Every structure is written in C-alpha cells, then in structure tokens.
Amino acid sequence: PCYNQTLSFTVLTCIISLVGLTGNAVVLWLLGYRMRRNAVSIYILNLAAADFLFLSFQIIRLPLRLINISHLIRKILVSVMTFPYFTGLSMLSAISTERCLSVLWPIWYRCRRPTHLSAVVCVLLWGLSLLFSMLEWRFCDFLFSSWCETSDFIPVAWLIFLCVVLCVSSLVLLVRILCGSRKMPLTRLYVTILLTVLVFLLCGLPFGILGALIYRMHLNLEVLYCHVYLVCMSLSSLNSSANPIIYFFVGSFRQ
Ligand SMILES: C[C@H](CCC(=O)O)[C@H]1CC[C@H]2[C@@H]3CC[C@@H]4C[C@H](OP(=O)(O)O)CC[C@]4(C)[C@H]3C[C@H](O)[C@]12C
C-alpha cells in the first residue's frame, strides 16, 4: 500500500470477487449436468471453472495485503494466478474464433466438425497455459542453455497473439455478417460482440499488459505503481466476474 486508499479498493475487489464466484458456481452447476455440451458450451464451462479459480485466488490474495505483509508469498500467488488468467484469456479467444468459424462455414461446423475438437483444443489451451508461465521466472531456468536471460518476450508474444486473434476473429465475423442478407436481428449481434471486445480490452487485458511491462522493466512497484496495480487487478476481477454473465445468463434470460 502506498500510504492509504487501499482498504476500500480491496473491499470493492473482494465484493466483485464474491459475486464472481457466485455467478461462476451457478453457471458451473447448470452447465455441468443441466446441459448438453453442444459445441461451445464446453468452452463456457471450462472458462467459468478457470474464472472461479481466478476470483477464488483474488479473495485469497487481497485480504492479506492489509495484515501480515510478507512480500514473498505475494509473488507466489501472482505467479500461480498468472496461469488461470492465461487460461481464461485463451478461452475467450477460442470462443471468439470458434463463433467466427461457425459463422464463416456453418455447414462444416454443424456437419464436418469432429465433434470432439472442442475438448482437444481445450486441453491444448490448458497445456499451453501451463507453459508461458515463465515470463518473470528467470530463476534457475538454465538447469543444463540457449534461453533468453532477461528479455524473454515469448509469453508476451503469446498474449499479443491471443489478443490479435480475438480482435481479427471478431472483425471477420462482423465483415461476414455485414456482407450478407440482412435478417436484421442486427442489434443483439452488435451489442454482444461490442460488449465482449470491450470487456476483453478495457478489462482483463490490462492485467496481462501490466504483468508484461512490469517484468520487462523490473519495477519494484515503487510508490508510483501502487495505484495502477490495484486498478488493473480490479479490472481483471470485474472482467472475470461478468464473464459468465455475457456468455450464459444473457442467453438463459433471453427466453
Ligand atoms: C499476469 C502477469 C504475467 C503475465 C505476463 O506478462 O506474461 C503476472 C506475472 C507475475 C505478476 C506480477 C508479479 C508481482 C508483481 C509485484 C507485486 O507483487 P505482490 O507482492 O503480490 O503485491 C504486485 C503483483 C505484480 C504486479 C504481478 C503483476 C502481474 O500480474 C504479473 C507480472
């Protein structure tokens, strides 16, 4: 904490996290058994599970900032929490590109899909989220040699690839929709895509870019960067909290 203005910030973070696990738990309970796992609901299911892990780790992390400062276990929690965050961003990107592919070629999607590619790509995303967690961890990495000592920007490359592929998938979906017959439910489609892109860039992505440029330039959080880290953490928490809403509750409450 800089001097003050931290207790209310972590209280807001904790409340947002509480509603986050509430929503993630209800959506996980509904989709786990009261669902059919058609083609994308698997993505929503495991994304909601990873998000539940996220907000749970948030409620584990924040209340220890005010009492019993330790400065080491904190690094451990942010290090481990990097993995569920990467998983959640990967699942958001996968959902976006998967919807884009479904719209681009619907016949292939509905007929010629292997009907198990969802699980395969899900486990590949989880495995690659196990990887790329060694951005800041330049600690005893060389256990043997050709390894980027300090300027290791491969996880940054993965994150920027995820962001750009999500953006290009949304753009291609919009171009395909706007270059065809206008059935004109073209207000629900506008709002959902705009909301997903906005909640990915304005929220969530700030946490990733914060980690990226905080381990690229080794900043000790000084007293100048103890006010923006809280904002980034709460933005990521709110993104993870509202993530189940947009993808499941909007559809469920539509009828
Ligand atoms: C998501 C990114 C990595 C993603 C990436 O770039 O590929 C994660 C990785 C390690 C995380 C930082 C480690 C400790 C940083 C310093 C402080 O640590 P505390 O004692 O807990 O207050 C605050 C947390 C802190 C600002 C974390 C911010 C950010 O979330 C990081 C860098």
PDB file of all heavy atoms in Angstrom, residues 43 46 83 86-95 97-98 117-132 158 161-162:
ATOM      1  N   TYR A  43     -16.595 -24.691 -23.912  1.00  0.00           N
ATOM      2  CA  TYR A  43     -15.713 -23.549 -23.698  1.00  0.00           C
ATOM      3  C   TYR A  43     -16.216 -22.676 -22.560  1.00  0.00           C
ATOM      4  O   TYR A  43     -15.433 -22.252 -21.704  1.00  0.00           O
ATOM      5  CB  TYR A  43     -15.592 -22.715 -24.970  1.00  0.00           C
ATOM      6  CG  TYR A  43     -14.958 -23.411 -26.145  1.00  0.00           C
ATOM      7  CD1 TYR A  43     -15.666 -23.595 -27.320  1.00  0.00           C
ATOM      8  CD2 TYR A  43     -13.651 -23.871 -26.089  1.00  0.00           C
ATOM      9  CE1 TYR A  43     -15.104 -24.222 -28.401  1.00  0.00           C
ATOM     10  CE2 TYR A  43     -13.076 -24.500 -27.173  1.00  0.00           C
ATOM     11  CZ  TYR A  43     -13.811 -24.672 -28.327  1.00  0.00           C
ATOM     12  OH  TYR A  43     -13.264 -25.296 -29.420  1.00  0.00           O
ATOM     13  N   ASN A  46     -15.510 -24.621 -19.099  1.00  0.00           N
ATOM     14  CA  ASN A  46     -14.173 -24.623 -18.509  1.00  0.00           C
ATOM     15  C   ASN A  46     -13.647 -23.207 -18.323  1.00  0.00           C
ATOM     16  O   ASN A  46     -12.835 -22.969 -17.421  1.00  0.00           O
ATOM     17  CB  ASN A  46     -13.183 -25.453 -19.330  1.00  0.00           C
ATOM     18  CG  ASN A  46     -13.405 -25.338 -20.805  1.00  0.00           C
ATOM     19  OD1 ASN A  46     -13.976 -24.366 -21.270  1.00  0.00           O
ATOM     20  ND2 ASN A  46     -12.962 -26.336 -21.555  1.00  0.00           N
ATOM     21  N   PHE A  83      -1.463 -18.313 -14.371  1.00  0.00           N
ATOM     22  CA  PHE A  83      -1.903 -19.438 -15.195  1.00  0.00           C
ATOM     23  C   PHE A  83      -3.411 -19.451 -15.429  1.00  0.00           C
ATOM     24  O   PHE A  83      -3.828 -19.583 -16.594  1.00  0.00           O
ATOM     25  CB  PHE A  83      -1.387 -20.743 -14.570  1.00  0.00           C
ATOM     26  CG  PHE A  83      -2.212 -21.959 -14.896  1.00  0.00           C
ATOM     27  CD1 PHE A  83      -2.339 -22.398 -16.201  1.00  0.00           C
ATOM     28  CD2 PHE A  83      -2.817 -22.693 -13.887  1.00  0.00           C
ATOM     29  CE1 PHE A  83      -3.084 -23.519 -16.498  1.00  0.00           C
ATOM     30  CE2 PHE A  83      -3.558 -23.821 -14.181  1.00  0.00           C
ATOM     31  CZ  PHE A  83      -3.689 -24.233 -15.489  1.00  0.00           C
ATOM     32  N   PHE A  86      -4.230 -16.655 -17.948  1.00  0.00           N
ATOM     33  CA  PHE A  86      -3.905 -17.040 -19.313  1.00  0.00           C
ATOM     34  C   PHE A  86      -4.934 -18.018 -19.855  1.00  0.00           C
ATOM     35  O   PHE A  86      -5.335 -17.924 -21.020  1.00  0.00           O
ATOM     36  CB  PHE A  86      -2.505 -17.646 -19.363  1.00  0.00           C
ATOM     37  CG  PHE A  86      -1.440 -16.677 -19.785  1.00  0.00           C
ATOM     38  CD1 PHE A  86      -0.975 -15.718 -18.904  1.00  0.00           C
ATOM     39  CD2 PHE A  86      -0.901 -16.728 -21.058  1.00  0.00           C
ATOM     40  CE1 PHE A  86       0.003 -14.824 -19.283  1.00  0.00           C
ATOM     41  CE2 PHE A  86       0.079 -15.836 -21.445  1.00  0.00           C
ATOM     42  CZ  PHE A  86       0.531 -14.883 -20.555  1.00  0.00           C
ATOM     43  N   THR A  87      -5.382 -18.958 -19.019  1.00  0.00           N
ATOM     44  CA  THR A  87      -6.404 -19.905 -19.454  1.00  0.00           C
ATOM     45  C   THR A  87      -7.699 -19.188 -19.816  1.00  0.00           C
ATOM     46  O   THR A  87      -8.325 -19.488 -20.836  1.00  0.00           O
ATOM     47  CB  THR A  87      -6.656 -20.947 -18.366  1.00  0.00           C
ATOM     48  OG1 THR A  87      -5.586 -21.899 -18.356  1.00  0.00           O
ATOM     49  CG2 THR A  87      -7.957 -21.682 -18.632  1.00  0.00           C
ATOM     50  N   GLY A  88      -8.113 -18.229 -18.987  1.00  0.00           N
ATOM     51  CA  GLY A  88      -9.342 -17.503 -19.264  1.00  0.00           C
ATOM     52  C   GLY A  88      -9.264 -16.676 -20.533  1.00  0.00           C
ATOM     53  O   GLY A  88     -10.205 -16.659 -21.333  1.00  0.00           O
ATOM     54  N   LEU A  89      -8.146 -15.976 -20.736  1.00  0.00           N
ATOM     55  CA  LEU A  89      -7.986 -15.227 -21.977  1.00  0.00           C
ATOM     56  C   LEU A  89      -7.950 -16.154 -23.186  1.00  0.00           C
ATOM     57  O   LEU A  89      -8.525 -15.832 -24.234  1.00  0.00           O
ATOM     58  CB  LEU A  89      -6.723 -14.372 -21.929  1.00  0.00           C
ATOM     59  CG  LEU A  89      -6.781 -13.128 -21.043  1.00  0.00           C
ATOM     60  CD1 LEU A  89      -5.705 -12.144 -21.462  1.00  0.00           C
ATOM     61  CD2 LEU A  89      -8.156 -12.481 -21.071  1.00  0.00           C
ATOM     62  N   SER A  90      -7.291 -17.307 -23.055  1.00  0.00           N
ATOM     63  CA  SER A  90      -7.260 -18.275 -24.143  1.00  0.00           C
ATOM     64  C   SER A  90      -8.656 -18.785 -24.461  1.00  0.00           C
ATOM     65  O   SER A  90      -9.000 -18.969 -25.631  1.00  0.00           O
ATOM     66  CB  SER A  90      -6.335 -19.435 -23.781  1.00  0.00           C
ATOM     67  OG  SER A  90      -5.076 -18.963 -23.339  1.00  0.00           O
ATOM     68  N   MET A  91      -9.472 -19.021 -23.435  1.00  0.00           N
ATOM     69  CA  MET A  91     -10.836 -19.482 -23.673  1.00  0.00           C
ATOM     70  C   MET A  91     -11.697 -18.403 -24.311  1.00  0.00           C
ATOM     71  O   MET A  91     -12.530 -18.711 -25.168  1.00  0.00           O
ATOM     72  CB  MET A  91     -11.468 -19.968 -22.372  1.00  0.00           C
ATOM     73  CG  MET A  91     -10.764 -21.164 -21.772  1.00  0.00           C
ATOM     74  SD  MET A  91     -10.879 -22.606 -22.839  1.00  0.00           S
ATOM     75  CE  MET A  91     -10.408 -23.890 -21.694  1.00  0.00           C
ATOM     76  N   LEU A  92     -11.526 -17.143 -23.908  1.00  0.00           N
ATOM     77  CA  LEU A  92     -12.253 -16.060 -24.568  1.00  0.00           C
ATOM     78  C   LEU A  92     -11.878 -15.970 -26.041  1.00  0.00           C
ATOM     79  O   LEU A  92     -12.748 -15.846 -26.914  1.00  0.00           O
ATOM     80  CB  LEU A  92     -11.979 -14.735 -23.860  1.00  0.00           C
ATOM     81  CG  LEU A  92     -12.551 -14.613 -22.450  1.00  0.00           C
ATOM     82  CD1 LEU A  92     -12.401 -13.199 -21.925  1.00  0.00           C
ATOM     83  CD2 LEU A  92     -14.008 -15.020 -22.465  1.00  0.00           C
ATOM     84  N   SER A  93     -10.578 -16.043 -26.335  1.00  0.00           N
ATOM     85  CA  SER A  93     -10.136 -16.020 -27.725  1.00  0.00           C
ATOM     86  C   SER A  93     -10.663 -17.224 -28.492  1.00  0.00           C
ATOM     87  O   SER A  93     -11.046 -17.105 -29.662  1.00  0.00           O
ATOM     88  CB  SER A  93      -8.612 -15.974 -27.788  1.00  0.00           C
ATOM     89  OG  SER A  93      -8.153 -16.415 -29.051  1.00  0.00           O
ATOM     90  N   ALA A  94     -10.673 -18.396 -27.854  1.00  0.00           N
ATOM     91  CA  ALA A  94     -11.177 -19.599 -28.503  1.00  0.00           C
ATOM     92  C   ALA A  94     -12.660 -19.477 -28.809  1.00  0.00           C
ATOM     93  O   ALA A  94     -13.108 -19.866 -29.889  1.00  0.00           O
ATOM     94  CB  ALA A  94     -10.907 -20.821 -27.627  1.00  0.00           C
ATOM     95  N   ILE A  95     -13.437 -18.929 -27.875  1.00  0.00           N
ATOM     96  CA  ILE A  95     -14.859 -18.711 -28.117  1.00  0.00           C
ATOM     97  C   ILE A  95     -15.057 -17.757 -29.286  1.00  0.00           C
ATOM     98  O   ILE A  95     -15.890 -17.997 -30.168  1.00  0.00           O
ATOM     99  CB  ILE A  95     -15.543 -18.183 -26.843  1.00  0.00           C
ATOM    100  CG1 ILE A  95     -15.645 -19.283 -25.792  1.00  0.00           C
ATOM    101  CG2 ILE A  95     -16.919 -17.629 -27.165  1.00  0.00           C
ATOM    102  CD1 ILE A  95     -15.923 -18.767 -24.400  1.00  0.00           C
ATOM    103  N   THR A  97     -12.973 -16.963 -31.858  1.00  0.00           N
ATOM    104  CA  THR A  97     -12.613 -17.546 -33.146  1.00  0.00           C
ATOM    105  C   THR A  97     -13.520 -18.714 -33.501  1.00  0.00           C
ATOM    106  O   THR A  97     -13.745 -18.982 -34.685  1.00  0.00           O
ATOM    107  CB  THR A  97     -11.151 -17.997 -33.160  1.00  0.00           C
ATOM    108  OG1 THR A  97     -10.851 -18.582 -34.432  1.00  0.00           O
ATOM    109  CG2 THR A  97     -10.895 -19.033 -32.089  1.00  0.00           C
ATOM    110  N   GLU A  98     -14.088 -19.390 -32.502  1.00  0.00           N
ATOM    111  CA  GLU A  98     -14.952 -20.526 -32.779  1.00  0.00           C
ATOM    112  C   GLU A  98     -16.291 -20.055 -33.328  1.00  0.00           C
ATOM    113  O   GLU A  98     -16.817 -20.633 -34.285  1.00  0.00           O
ATOM    114  CB  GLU A  98     -15.146 -21.339 -31.499  1.00  0.00           C
ATOM    115  CG  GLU A  98     -14.407 -22.677 -31.445  1.00  0.00           C
ATOM    116  CD  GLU A  98     -14.530 -23.511 -32.699  1.00  0.00           C
ATOM    117  OE1 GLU A  98     -15.567 -23.429 -33.375  1.00  0.00           O
ATOM    118  OE2 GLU A  98     -13.579 -24.260 -33.008  1.00  0.00           O
ATOM    119  N   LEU A 117     -13.326 -31.831 -31.268  1.00  0.00           N
ATOM    120  CA  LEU A 117     -12.261 -30.842 -31.375  1.00  0.00           C
ATOM    121  C   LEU A 117     -12.301 -29.863 -30.212  1.00  0.00           C
ATOM    122  O   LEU A 117     -11.263 -29.319 -29.827  1.00  0.00           O
ATOM    123  CB  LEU A 117     -12.374 -30.121 -32.724  1.00  0.00           C
ATOM    124  CG  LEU A 117     -11.441 -29.040 -33.293  1.00  0.00           C
ATOM    125  CD1 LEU A 117     -11.910 -28.699 -34.696  1.00  0.00           C
ATOM    126  CD2 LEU A 117     -11.379 -27.759 -32.475  1.00  0.00           C
ATOM    127  N   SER A 118     -13.483 -29.632 -29.640  1.00  0.00           N
ATOM    128  CA  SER A 118     -13.593 -28.705 -28.519  1.00  0.00           C
ATOM    129  C   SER A 118     -12.751 -29.169 -27.338  1.00  0.00           C
ATOM    130  O   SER A 118     -11.979 -28.391 -26.771  1.00  0.00           O
ATOM    131  CB  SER A 118     -15.057 -28.551 -28.109  1.00  0.00           C
ATOM    132  OG  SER A 118     -15.163 -27.950 -26.831  1.00  0.00           O
ATOM    133  N   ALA A 119     -12.874 -30.444 -26.964  1.00  0.00           N
ATOM    134  CA  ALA A 119     -12.098 -30.960 -25.840  1.00  0.00           C
ATOM    135  C   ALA A 119     -10.608 -30.975 -26.152  1.00  0.00           C
ATOM    136  O   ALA A 119      -9.783 -30.669 -25.282  1.00  0.00           O
ATOM    137  CB  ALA A 119     -12.584 -32.360 -25.469  1.00  0.00           C
ATOM    138  N   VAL A 120     -10.242 -31.330 -27.384  1.00  0.00           N
ATOM    139  CA  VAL A 120      -8.829 -31.380 -27.757  1.00  0.00           C
ATOM    140  C   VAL A 120      -8.208 -29.991 -27.677  1.00  0.00           C
ATOM    141  O   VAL A 120      -7.136 -29.803 -27.092  1.00  0.00           O
ATOM    142  CB  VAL A 120      -8.665 -31.989 -29.160  1.00  0.00           C
ATOM    143  CG1 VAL A 120      -7.210 -31.935 -29.592  1.00  0.00           C
ATOM    144  CG2 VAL A 120      -9.179 -33.418 -29.178  1.00  0.00           C
ATOM    145  N   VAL A 121      -8.877 -28.992 -28.255  1.00  0.00           N
ATOM    146  CA  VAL A 121      -8.328 -27.642 -28.213  1.00  0.00           C
ATOM    147  C   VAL A 121      -8.372 -27.090 -26.796  1.00  0.00           C
ATOM    148  O   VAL A 121      -7.503 -26.307 -26.408  1.00  0.00           O
ATOM    149  CB  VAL A 121      -9.055 -26.721 -29.210  1.00  0.00           C
ATOM    150  CG1 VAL A 121     -10.444 -26.392 -28.726  1.00  0.00           C
ATOM    151  CG2 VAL A 121      -8.253 -25.449 -29.433  1.00  0.00           C
ATOM    152  N   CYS A 122      -9.355 -27.500 -25.992  1.00  0.00           N
ATOM    153  CA  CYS A 122      -9.392 -27.074 -24.599  1.00  0.00           C
ATOM    154  C   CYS A 122      -8.181 -27.590 -23.835  1.00  0.00           C
ATOM    155  O   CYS A 122      -7.528 -26.839 -23.102  1.00  0.00           O
ATOM    156  CB  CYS A 122     -10.689 -27.552 -23.947  1.00  0.00           C
ATOM    157  SG  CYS A 122     -10.717 -27.395 -22.154  1.00  0.00           S
ATOM    158  N   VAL A 123      -7.858 -28.876 -23.999  1.00  0.00           N
ATOM    159  CA  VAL A 123      -6.715 -29.416 -23.273  1.00  0.00           C
ATOM    160  C   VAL A 123      -5.409 -28.857 -23.828  1.00  0.00           C
ATOM    161  O   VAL A 123      -4.448 -28.661 -23.075  1.00  0.00           O
ATOM    162  CB  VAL A 123      -6.733 -30.957 -23.264  1.00  0.00           C
ATOM    163  CG1 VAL A 123      -8.049 -31.465 -22.695  1.00  0.00           C
ATOM    164  CG2 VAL A 123      -6.488 -31.526 -24.647  1.00  0.00           C
ATOM    165  N   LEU A 124      -5.345 -28.566 -25.132  1.00  0.00           N
ATOM    166  CA  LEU A 124      -4.158 -27.899 -25.667  1.00  0.00           C
ATOM    167  C   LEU A 124      -3.995 -26.501 -25.081  1.00  0.00           C
ATOM    168  O   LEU A 124      -2.877 -26.085 -24.756  1.00  0.00           O
ATOM    169  CB  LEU A 124      -4.210 -27.835 -27.193  1.00  0.00           C
ATOM    170  CG  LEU A 124      -4.276 -29.145 -27.981  1.00  0.00           C
ATOM    171  CD1 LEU A 124      -3.767 -28.939 -29.397  1.00  0.00           C
ATOM    172  CD2 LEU A 124      -3.480 -30.238 -27.284  1.00  0.00           C
ATOM    173  N   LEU A 125      -5.095 -25.757 -24.944  1.00  0.00           N
ATOM    174  CA  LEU A 125      -5.024 -24.433 -24.335  1.00  0.00           C
ATOM    175  C   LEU A 125      -4.595 -24.520 -22.879  1.00  0.00           C
ATOM    176  O   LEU A 125      -3.781 -23.715 -22.415  1.00  0.00           O
ATOM    177  CB  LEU A 125      -6.368 -23.717 -24.454  1.00  0.00           C
ATOM    178  CG  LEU A 125      -6.780 -23.286 -25.861  1.00  0.00           C
ATOM    179  CD1 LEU A 125      -8.036 -22.436 -25.813  1.00  0.00           C
ATOM    180  CD2 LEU A 125      -5.648 -22.535 -26.539  1.00  0.00           C
ATOM    181  N   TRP A 126      -5.125 -25.497 -22.139  1.00  0.00           N
ATOM    182  CA  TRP A 126      -4.707 -25.674 -20.752  1.00  0.00           C
ATOM    183  C   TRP A 126      -3.223 -26.011 -20.668  1.00  0.00           C
ATOM    184  O   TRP A 126      -2.499 -25.466 -19.825  1.00  0.00           O
ATOM    185  CB  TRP A 126      -5.540 -26.767 -20.085  1.00  0.00           C
ATOM    186  CG  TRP A 126      -6.887 -26.313 -19.614  1.00  0.00           C
ATOM    187  CD1 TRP A 126      -8.074 -26.479 -20.257  1.00  0.00           C
ATOM    188  CD2 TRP A 126      -7.187 -25.629 -18.394  1.00  0.00           C
ATOM    189  NE1 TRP A 126      -9.095 -25.940 -19.519  1.00  0.00           N
ATOM    190  CE2 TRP A 126      -8.576 -25.410 -18.368  1.00  0.00           C
ATOM    191  CE3 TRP A 126      -6.415 -25.180 -17.320  1.00  0.00           C
ATOM    192  CZ2 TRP A 126      -9.211 -24.762 -17.313  1.00  0.00           C
ATOM    193  CZ3 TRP A 126      -7.047 -24.535 -16.273  1.00  0.00           C
ATOM    194  CH2 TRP A 126      -8.430 -24.333 -16.277  1.00  0.00           C
ATOM    195  N   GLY A 127      -2.749 -26.898 -21.545  1.00  0.00           N
ATOM    196  CA  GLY A 127      -1.342 -27.261 -21.534  1.00  0.00           C
ATOM    197  C   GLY A 127      -0.434 -26.098 -21.883  1.00  0.00           C
ATOM    198  O   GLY A 127       0.624 -25.921 -21.276  1.00  0.00           O
ATOM    199  N   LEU A 128      -0.832 -25.292 -22.868  1.00  0.00           N
ATOM    200  CA  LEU A 128      -0.055 -24.108 -23.215  1.00  0.00           C
ATOM    201  C   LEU A 128      -0.159 -23.031 -22.147  1.00  0.00           C
ATOM    202  O   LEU A 128       0.703 -22.148 -22.089  1.00  0.00           O
ATOM    203  CB  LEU A 128      -0.510 -23.553 -24.566  1.00  0.00           C
ATOM    204  CG  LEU A 128       0.231 -24.034 -25.819  1.00  0.00           C
ATOM    205  CD1 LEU A 128       1.475 -23.199 -26.056  1.00  0.00           C
ATOM    206  CD2 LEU A 128       0.587 -25.511 -25.732  1.00  0.00           C
ATOM    207  N   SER A 129      -1.199 -23.074 -21.314  1.00  0.00           N
ATOM    208  CA  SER A 129      -1.279 -22.178 -20.168  1.00  0.00           C
ATOM    209  C   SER A 129      -0.359 -22.636 -19.043  1.00  0.00           C
ATOM    210  O   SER A 129       0.155 -21.806 -18.285  1.00  0.00           O
ATOM    211  CB  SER A 129      -2.723 -22.080 -19.681  1.00  0.00           C
ATOM    212  OG  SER A 129      -3.619 -21.956 -20.771  1.00  0.00           O
ATOM    213  N   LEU A 130      -0.150 -23.951 -18.909  1.00  0.00           N
ATOM    214  CA  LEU A 130       0.950 -24.423 -18.072  1.00  0.00           C
ATOM    215  C   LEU A 130       2.271 -23.848 -18.560  1.00  0.00           C
ATOM    216  O   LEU A 130       3.076 -23.350 -17.765  1.00  0.00           O
ATOM    217  CB  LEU A 130       1.018 -25.952 -18.059  1.00  0.00           C
ATOM    218  CG  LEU A 130      -0.228 -26.833 -18.129  1.00  0.00           C
ATOM    219  CD1 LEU A 130       0.148 -28.288 -17.912  1.00  0.00           C
ATOM    220  CD2 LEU A 130      -1.218 -26.408 -17.064  1.00  0.00           C
ATOM    221  N   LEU A 131       2.505 -23.901 -19.868  1.00  0.00           N
ATOM    222  CA  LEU A 131       3.629 -23.209 -20.468  1.00  0.00           C
ATOM    223  C   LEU A 131       3.358 -21.705 -20.465  1.00  0.00           C
ATOM    224  O   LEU A 131       2.295 -21.238 -20.048  1.00  0.00           O
ATOM    225  CB  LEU A 131       3.868 -23.728 -21.887  1.00  0.00           C
ATOM    226  CG  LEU A 131       5.218 -23.511 -22.577  1.00  0.00           C
ATOM    227  CD1 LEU A 131       6.360 -23.922 -21.666  1.00  0.00           C
ATOM    228  CD2 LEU A 131       5.274 -24.270 -23.895  1.00  0.00           C
ATOM    229  N   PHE A 132       4.351 -20.938 -20.913  1.00  0.00           N
ATOM    230  CA  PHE A 132       4.265 -19.482 -20.997  1.00  0.00           C
ATOM    231  C   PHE A 132       3.970 -18.833 -19.648  1.00  0.00           C
ATOM    232  O   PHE A 132       3.637 -17.646 -19.586  1.00  0.00           O
ATOM    233  CB  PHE A 132       3.224 -19.046 -22.035  1.00  0.00           C
ATOM    234  CG  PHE A 132       3.587 -19.407 -23.446  1.00  0.00           C
ATOM    235  CD1 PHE A 132       2.608 -19.745 -24.361  1.00  0.00           C
ATOM    236  CD2 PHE A 132       4.909 -19.397 -23.859  1.00  0.00           C
ATOM    237  CE1 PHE A 132       2.939 -20.070 -25.660  1.00  0.00           C
ATOM    238  CE2 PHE A 132       5.245 -19.725 -25.157  1.00  0.00           C
ATOM    239  CZ  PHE A 132       4.258 -20.062 -26.058  1.00  0.00           C
ATOM    240  N   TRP A 158       2.820 -14.674 -26.998  1.00  0.00           N
ATOM    241  CA  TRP A 158       1.607 -15.482 -26.897  1.00  0.00           C
ATOM    242  C   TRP A 158       0.400 -14.630 -26.526  1.00  0.00           C
ATOM    243  O   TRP A 158      -0.684 -14.790 -27.100  1.00  0.00           O
ATOM    244  CB  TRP A 158       1.811 -16.594 -25.868  1.00  0.00           C
ATOM    245  CG  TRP A 158       0.596 -17.432 -25.617  1.00  0.00           C
ATOM    246  CD1 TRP A 158      -0.140 -17.481 -24.470  1.00  0.00           C
ATOM    247  CD2 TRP A 158      -0.010 -18.359 -26.523  1.00  0.00           C
ATOM    248  NE1 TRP A 158      -1.174 -18.374 -24.608  1.00  0.00           N
ATOM    249  CE2 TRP A 158      -1.116 -18.927 -25.860  1.00  0.00           C
ATOM    250  CE3 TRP A 158       0.270 -18.761 -27.832  1.00  0.00           C
ATOM    251  CZ2 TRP A 158      -1.940 -19.874 -26.462  1.00  0.00           C
ATOM    252  CZ3 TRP A 158      -0.548 -19.701 -28.427  1.00  0.00           C
ATOM    253  CH2 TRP A 158      -1.640 -20.247 -27.742  1.00  0.00           C
ATOM    254  N   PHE A 161      -0.572 -12.484 -29.437  1.00  0.00           N
ATOM    255  CA  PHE A 161      -1.208 -13.328 -30.439  1.00  0.00           C
ATOM    256  C   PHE A 161      -2.651 -13.623 -30.064  1.00  0.00           C
ATOM    257  O   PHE A 161      -3.540 -13.585 -30.920  1.00  0.00           O
ATOM    258  CB  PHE A 161      -0.426 -14.629 -30.611  1.00  0.00           C
ATOM    259  CG  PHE A 161      -1.268 -15.785 -31.060  1.00  0.00           C
ATOM    260  CD1 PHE A 161      -1.630 -15.917 -32.389  1.00  0.00           C
ATOM    261  CD2 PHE A 161      -1.698 -16.740 -30.156  1.00  0.00           C
ATOM    262  CE1 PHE A 161      -2.406 -16.979 -32.809  1.00  0.00           C
ATOM    263  CE2 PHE A 161      -2.476 -17.804 -30.568  1.00  0.00           C
ATOM    264  CZ  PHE A 161      -2.829 -17.925 -31.897  1.00  0.00           C
ATOM    265  N   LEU A 162      -2.902 -13.922 -28.789  1.00  0.00           N
ATOM    266  CA  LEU A 162      -4.271 -14.165 -28.341  1.00  0.00           C
ATOM    267  C   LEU A 162      -5.141 -12.935 -28.558  1.00  0.00           C
ATOM    268  O   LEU A 162      -6.256 -13.028 -29.088  1.00  0.00           O
ATOM    269  CB  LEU A 162      -4.271 -14.569 -26.868  1.00  0.00           C
ATOM    270  CG  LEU A 162      -3.994 -16.037 -26.548  1.00  0.00           C
ATOM    271  CD1 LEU A 162      -4.204 -16.299 -25.068  1.00  0.00           C
ATOM    272  CD2 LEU A 162      -4.878 -16.944 -27.386  1.00  0.00           C
TER     273      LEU A 162
END
